[PDB]
Design a protein around this ligand. Structure first.
Ligand SMILES: Nc1ncnc2c1ncn2[C@@H]1O[C@H](COP(=O)(O)OP(=O)(O)O)[C@@H](O)[C@H]1O
Ligand SMILES: Nc1ncnc2c1ncn2[C@@H]1O[C@H](COP(=O)(O)OP(=O)(O)O)[C@@H](O)[C@H]1O
Ligand SMILES: Nc1ncnc2c1ncn2[C@@H]1O[C@H](COP(=O)(O)OP(=O)(O)O)[C@@H](O)[C@H]1O
Ligand SMILES: Nc1ncnc2c1ncn2[C@@H]1O[C@H](COP(=O)(O)OP(=O)(O)O)[C@@H](O)[C@H]1O
Ligand SMILES: [Mg+2]
Ligand SMILES: [Mg+2]
Ligand SMILES: [Mg+2]
Ligand SMILES: [Mg+2]
Lengths: 443, 439, 49, 94, 441, 433
């Protein structure tokens, strides 16, 4: 909860961190079952972590609420940090200024990982106190007094007129580059904190660094190449990193950047980091997207995609014919399938108890068993909402335990989907059809 | 000088600790189950303990969904954020509607920040004067500037940037300033009243002399959501050259908010709250006329409800066995697909009754400060019971107009029948339009 | 004023100017030596016209 | 006590031609605390409702039809046409 | 160090006199397709015809993309290769016609080469060569200017016109730091030297070791640039305080509709340079695959543009058969392409391989992945690959090897493959799962 | 001067080879056969060079691959030179910065042109002496350039700003130099040596220059200020009609007095068999405009529904524009015609085919299309070049034919194996078993 995150429907599940044996357990990290599925997911996660083979694919199927999004989030958590995760849903690719194909290309460009290193030099602790003997800078040498060495530096045409640049009182810590660089102020000293009561926003006070001056500092960055694309898109392309006016990035920049990253990897200045793509409910997507990915997922830089959907025999959007899973055979051929299974009572009750723990909610035996019955006749999400509403009832009932009372009140005041449909069919008189058929009259 | 429009007669659910409702209180009459459920939900909301809760209610037109929404909005107080907007407003032009829905989720979540600031303020005296210590021309870094105020004068010098701020304000010796020391800049109160009256006319305001001691100190508490911070960061705020004036003169358009900005704002808000600057409150979201939404939204919300920061939303569909707008065969109760209803529960908002409707009409008469007779009240209530309460509601005011034109302060059967004759309803139009040669 | 300094010092930005300059450097200095007439930009075309 | 509210009234035409999103907009606006009175009219009767696949009386579905109020208007006889045309003529000073 | 169902198909098993063998050059089988593509490559190298096109016909995993990548590799940096799908043509920003013109101008290249003399060294001195003022007035008149230079092992003094004094005046040469001047073009250009670098503790001065080679040298540059680069350089306004350029930079310029006047002027200038010998044109192969989705308007447009004079070859790829052409259902034509294009274009067929060839494919893919399987399991691997598919076995071999590695193994034996095929399914099993399960799965 | 190109399909015929009475030769100037089509082209070209008639729609129909576009390009090239002529296609009508209305308007406007004459003066010779009085770091200077020929000695002078104009680049004391008076522009006729001899004749010569410009260009240059960028960037749309009327009356009165001369052009449209009925009505209104280039059309289909309508009007065109148009129908080729076309295409490729090569080309043209033969010639020539001789025998052609495919063979292959490739219901097969 580093950010303002409150709670998740699956916050107890943080990581598909299978044991060293990779043999699935009846219970692990809060999840129960998914044995062969968890084994295959661990294999896939290891293959992603390999970072040497691209162009893989895995498909996920099964009825929803079976932890599929939780499965992907746990995979991402088990992958650790420094690996940004592309959080894109199905309804995010039909954008206005970004066509679906290059939007997918941009998502992949974000999905890549890379590292960059650089080295610079500076001088630290330059409490200078210039004193020369008008203009012209005759005998242009400046005193420099840091913690370690306190000497006088000789200057030349660029510094004797560069010290008159950045006009300062020379009673502060300053930085200069020994590699023919400019002068930069890092702040004044503590003795300058008292001279002015209310220091100006520019003026800050920092101690003289406790050490030498000639500092050769190395820096490391982890920036996606698409960010560099946005940076060098125009003459001053720094404002566009956050605004979002990319503008359907051309492929010439893409191949130039591919060549640059290849040559920097050969130079050793850059190294790759694996990436993953995941979009939920792929069925509600255009057939054009499937056709495009079926070719674009075998490129040299082709991160694996976490395909997942739950529909049945239907038609791929953008066509008319009946299709398997609402997906083309071409996409349903170059991948491997993950499927889920109907819930059983034991994992239902354990998941309900774990959720209650995550919600700081206490559940007794009767309430737990009744809500397990609800979550087995219905789905578990209804019971996951009912635990919350029943704890609210209890804390309004001057107690913390949840029992038959709050659960039964919720059952009476919250309607099951089947009984809701029955009520709809038996009270259709008050309802409206497509043609605006409403019986407003009562008597 | 008052305007009541189908509301202002409601001020609360009218409940207790034990979930006991009141038959006539807070502008609500009846609906024991709905009031109990709303009270439980708002009690859960007030704890700030959760996020992403949802609920669907089945309620026909005039059954009281909007009234319940307004009452629940008023339950949490003005400070708790709320943004119930029409379901047809999603389909925007300059930004993709899923991005708009993310923007609304960003708006809904609330916060309370604070900051303590000091400030100094006419000018008693003025003495301007460091060394170049080298080849520089000079070094001006300190000027004693007067500070009159009212309760005591305390002149003081600071960084020279405050001096150039003094020239920037173009203040004379007899001119009052308001300099917040946090930045060293100048905020201009105006001219002064002491060194004033130098001329019989002055377009520039003389401005009252500042009141209190010069070294003013205060603290401010402001409740601001995050989307305002996002839009403030998006555009430049200052500048002096052509770019700033052209950009401000340029009209900004609604754009897409990047997720890296979401990470940045979450990081900074966490850093600020960890210092005690800000306190956290969730939000409340409501959408009416939801069944006109398309299947892509109805299925994207399946995963959007899993957002860990998304506040409590309330879902309201009035129809029945209808297909989602844009679905060839996805027909569902209330026009919401089953894979979406598997994430929330169902409430039943039902219409009203005889004594209930007559009390509603009487209370609307009260809020409209008009006197209603028993006979006219009963006629209005009865014909509402057969067809519709809203007919009587919209006949109340014209009947009062008729009574005023009759120089009386009550509705008589004559007034209500005259309004009925001069103003029809839907039922009388269900059997009269067919015999129209001209369309 | 200690609080003022403690709040004023951290004005850190996400992407530094050095991270931009290294991303806006020249590796291949130039090519196609005769290029003063293959383009002759529009700012000069208006002059020529 | 510095401003003066003047809550006027809006006039619109061709409501049968209006579309369902506008219907929902006005539906919520009517229930809103601030909404000026509406002068809305459909010349056509029992016409197709634009923006939807169904046709209802006045070109408007029964929801807004029951929400609002109705004033019917019938045609003219000849004598008032004669009077109107005479007024037109004397206005045109012919 | 990366691989995505690739890094095993290089070339086409080609040879002199156009012969394709059984198992060589990555490719296996498809002697007809490989020889046809080799003849196509020879035609491209010839650079005689304009705007030809060949389609493909086959099922999954027959070489279409493999053949396209093979010919792209055979082209090399000399001839650009531009891969594409018609789906990318859905450009919201600008119309389809402008996109196709831009792709056309991108697939047309021009290779420039030139050599400029360079006089290097370090300025050893600078002295006037005075003559008495002959014209109106008397006093000083420098006849010429001779200045010495010395690079590593090469010392020479340049005699030059006296006018270079202005360059010495203009460039602030100081003495012996940087020299850039030619015999005819003249004028010095400056970019000190490291020998003086220690004279200052810290500065913002530049330094360089002694130049190498002789004083006089030459440099050779080769650059292949598309005509579209010249067009966009002409179009896009770049500059400073001038209102046009800075206003354009402020406006965030978009894909403006460049007038054909500038395009034709660029073509004329390019031709007039090329014929002089200072330049020469080289075509570029545009390639578009999975073309079934392409609509009728693009079909008619390409049928019109097939006859263009500058038009480079465009190779097209698809795999459809008896279908309805995308764009509108009026034309129910083979390959999703109207017969207006089929009868006017060269069709090439493809077909999957035999068990031996496909088994060699699987084995070579295993070798590239560095995993391996013994015969006692690879026989059943081949049998199942024949039963199921090629992509199925190729993709599922890696999970088997990884499972073995996590099971403390390096070979693939009967167990791991048996349970791996037990766990995962395929397209036919996907349809069975669709029409067997009754719990929304 | 020559424009870059490769061996194009239409790089094989130039002109029509007509006569004084426009009688068609069976094979002349590339064009083969199409006697009455040639006569129609000839009468059209005389009609357009007459210049007395504007706005006449002409449409051509015929079977696919029947030389309609060949005749069109022959007519376009036969238009001579020094006269503008603009052409477009069936998918360039649409635009975003412009409406289809304005796109077609600009297409109509671009064809017509005007030419305004003016006088020009010039000085020419060889700078053989030069003397400039110029102070270093000053702001006052004079000069004397002795631009001379081999006829007399002439030390010319420079005024206030002319020093920079004549000293912008290298000017030496032998170099042949020509400068203009009213502008002072420098034109490098060539260095004397180190290679043109010193010129003879008189220094100052006068001449006349005529400048051409199209109607739309005149409309766009003077309408606004940034339109000069629109001359190349095209950053304008729907120019205000007031400027159009002003330039139209300006052109009318210029023609009336006689300062300039009109050079009417021609607009060309092909594959117009698909287009919106709105554009058809646009044509129907633009044809009777006072200024209107002659407009051509083209079609490949017959009875078909025009875009924007739902009636299958004949020729893909509404009957109103059909009636107001001149129809020139084309029929199939003769076997003599097709073999002559094959021979002329082979000699345009300058591929020394054998007699049997042309025999098989003609047999294919009888059996199937001709452009397929126009590719079979290339593949057979390359396969024969794999044998290094400059002849193509039956072996190369037969191998190329039984390795490649036309439409019908692939159609039948898919027909007998509909279950292998993707069908309309979306099933494809990867395994041979
Ligand atoms: N093995 C498990 N252990 C604990 N909780 C689980 C497990 N499986 C599912 N859940 C709970 O069920 C929910 C599954 O939702 P999910 O399948 O991610 O939604 P969707 O189907 O839309 O992706 C989660 O909120 C999680 O709390
Ligand atoms: N139970 C109730 N008690 C008092 N007034 C009510 C009640 N229900 C509805 N109303 C009034 O009826 C008016 C119209 O209600 P409306 O918003 O149309 O209901 P719904 O949202 O169910 O269509 C509202 O202004 C409200 O004040
Ligand atoms: N004829 C072939 N020879 C060698 N490799 C092939 C062949 N056909 C497919 N492949 C392999 O399959 C991948 C490309 O598949 P492709 O043939 O494009 O599928 P499709 O036939 O569906 O277009 C390549 O990575 C290549 O390794
Ligand atoms: N009589 C002919 N003279 C010259 N070329 C011809 C002739 N007939 C056909 N061609 C060639 O065959 C091709 C057929 O095109 P054409 O007949 O112009 O239009 P279309 O293909 O629409 O019928 C042309 O490119 C042309 O080069
Ligand atoms: Mg999900
Ligand atoms: Mg409403
Ligand atoms: Mg491919
Ligand atoms: Mg043609």
């Amino acid at each position: 909860l580093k950010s303002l995150s409150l709670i998740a429907a699956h916050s107890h599940i943080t990581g598909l961190g299978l044991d060293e044996n990779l043999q699935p357990r009846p219970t692990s990290e809060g999840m129960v079952g998914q044995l062969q599925a968890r084994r295959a997911a661990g294999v896939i996660l290891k293959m992603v972590q390999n970072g040497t083979i691209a162009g893989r694919a895995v498909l996920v199927a099964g009825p929803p609420s079976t932890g599929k999004t939780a499965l992907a989030m746990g995979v991402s958590q088990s992958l650790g940090k420094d690996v940004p995760f592309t959080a894109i849903a199905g309804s995010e690719i039909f954008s206005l200024e970004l066509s679906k194909t290059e939007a997918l290309t941009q998502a992949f460009r974000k999905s890549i990982g890379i590292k960059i290193k650089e080295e610079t030099e500076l001088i630290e602790g330059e409490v200078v106190e210039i004193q020369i003997d008008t203009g012209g800078h005759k005998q242009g040498k400046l005193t420099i007094k840091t913690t370690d060495m306190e000497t006088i530096y000789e200057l030349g045409n660029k510094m004797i007129d560069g010290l008159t640049k950045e006009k300062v009182l020379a009673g502060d810590v300053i930085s200069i580059d020994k590699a023919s660089g400019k002068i930069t102020k890092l702040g004044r000293s503590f003795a300058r904190s008292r001279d002015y009561d209310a220091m100006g926003a520019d003026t800050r006070f920092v101690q003289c660094p406790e050490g030498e001056l000639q500092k050769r500092k190395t820096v490391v960055h982890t920036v996606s190449l698409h960010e560099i694309d946005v940076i060098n898109s125009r003459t001053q392309g720094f404002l566009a990193l956050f605004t979002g006016d990319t503008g359907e990035i051309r492929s010439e920049v893409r191949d130039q950047i591919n060549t640059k990253v290849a040559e920097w990897k050969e130079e050793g200045k850059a190294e790759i980091v694996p990436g993953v793509l995941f979009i939920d409910e792929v069925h509600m997507l255009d057939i054009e997207c499937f056709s495009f990915i079926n070719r674009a997922l075998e490129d040299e830089f082709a991160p694996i995609v976490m395909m997942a959907t739950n529909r049945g025999v239907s038609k791929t959007r953008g066509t008319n014919y009946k299709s398997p899973h609402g997906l083309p055979l071409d996409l349903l051929d170059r991948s491997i399938i993950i499927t889920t299974k109907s819930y059983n009572e034991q994992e239902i009750k354990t998941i309900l108890s774990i959720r209650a723990q995550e919600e700081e909610v206490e559940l007794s035996s009767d309430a737990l068993d009744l809500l397990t019955k609800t979550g087995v006749e219905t789905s578990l999400r209804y019971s996951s909402n009912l635990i919350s509403v029943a704890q609210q009832i209890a804390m309004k009932r001057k107690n913390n335990t949840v029992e038959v009372e709050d659960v039964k009140r919720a059952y009476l005041l919250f309607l099951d989907s089947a009984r809701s449909v029955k009520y709809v069919q038996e009270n259709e008189s008050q309802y409206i059809d497509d043609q605006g058929n409403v019986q407003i009259s009562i008597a | 000088v008052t305007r009541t429009a189908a509301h202002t007669h409601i001020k609360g659910l009218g409940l207790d600790e034990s979930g006991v409702a009141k038959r006539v209180e807070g502008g609500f009459v009846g609906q024991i189950e709905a009031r109990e459920a709303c009270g439980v939900i708002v009690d859960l909301i007030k704890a700030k303990k959760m996020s992403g809760r949802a609920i669907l209610l089945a309620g026909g037109p005039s059954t009281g969904k909007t009234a319940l929404a307004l009452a629940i909005s008023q339950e949490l107080g003005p400070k708790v954020p709320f943004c119930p907007l029409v379901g047809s407003e999603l389909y925007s032009v300059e930004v993709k509607k899923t991005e708009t829905l993310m923007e609304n989720f960003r708006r809904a979540i609330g916060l309370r920040i604070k900051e303590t600031k000091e400030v100094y303020e006419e000018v008693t005296e003025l003495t301007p004067e460091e060394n170049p210590l080298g080849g520089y021309g000079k070094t001006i870094s300190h000027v004693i500037v007067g500070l009159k105020s009212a309760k005591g004068t305390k002149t003081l010098r600071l960084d020279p940037t405050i001096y150039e701020s003094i020239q920037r304000e173009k203040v004379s010796i007899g001119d009052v300033i308001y300099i917040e020391a946090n930045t060293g800049a100048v905020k201009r109160v105006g001219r002064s009243d002491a060194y004033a009256t130098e001329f019989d006319l002055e377009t520039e305001e003389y401005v009252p002399l500042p009141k209190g001691e010069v070294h003013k100190k205060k603290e401010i508490v402001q409740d601001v959501t995050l989307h305002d911070l996002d839009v403030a960061n998006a555009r430049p705020q200052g500048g002096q050259d052509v770019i700033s004036m052209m950009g401000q003169l340029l009209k900004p358009k609604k754009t897409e908010i990047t997720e890296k900005l979401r990470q940045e704002v979450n990081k900074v808000v966490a850093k600020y709250i960890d210092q005690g600057v800000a306190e956290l409150i969730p939000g409340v979201l409501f959408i009416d006329e939801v069944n006109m939404l398309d299947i892509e939204i109805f299925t994207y919300l399946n995963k959007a409800l899993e957002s860990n920061i998304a506040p409590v939303v309330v879902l309201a569909s009035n129809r029945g066995m209808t297909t989602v707008r844009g679905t060839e065969d996805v027909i569902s109760p209330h026009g919401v697909p089953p894979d979406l209803i598997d994430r929330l529960l169902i409430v039943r908002t039902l219409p009203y009754d005889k004594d209930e409707i007559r009390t509603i009409i009487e209370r609307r008469a009260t809020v409209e400060r008009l006197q209603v007779e028993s006979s006219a009240l009963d006629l209005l209530a009865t014909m509402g019971t057969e067809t519709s309460l809203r007919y009587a509601l919209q006949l109340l005011a014209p009947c009062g107009i008729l009574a005023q034109t009759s120089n009386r302060k009550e509705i008589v059967v004559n007034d209500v029948n005259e309004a009925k004759l001069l103003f029809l309803d839907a039922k009388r139009s269900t059997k009269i339009l067919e015999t129209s040669a001209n369309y | 004023v200690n609080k003022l300094r403690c709040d004023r010092r951290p004005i850190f930005g996400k992407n530094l100017i050095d991270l931009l300059t290294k991303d806006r450097r020249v590796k291949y200095d130039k090519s196609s030596i005769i290029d003063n007439e293959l383009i002759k930009p529009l700012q000069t075309r208006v002059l020529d016209n």
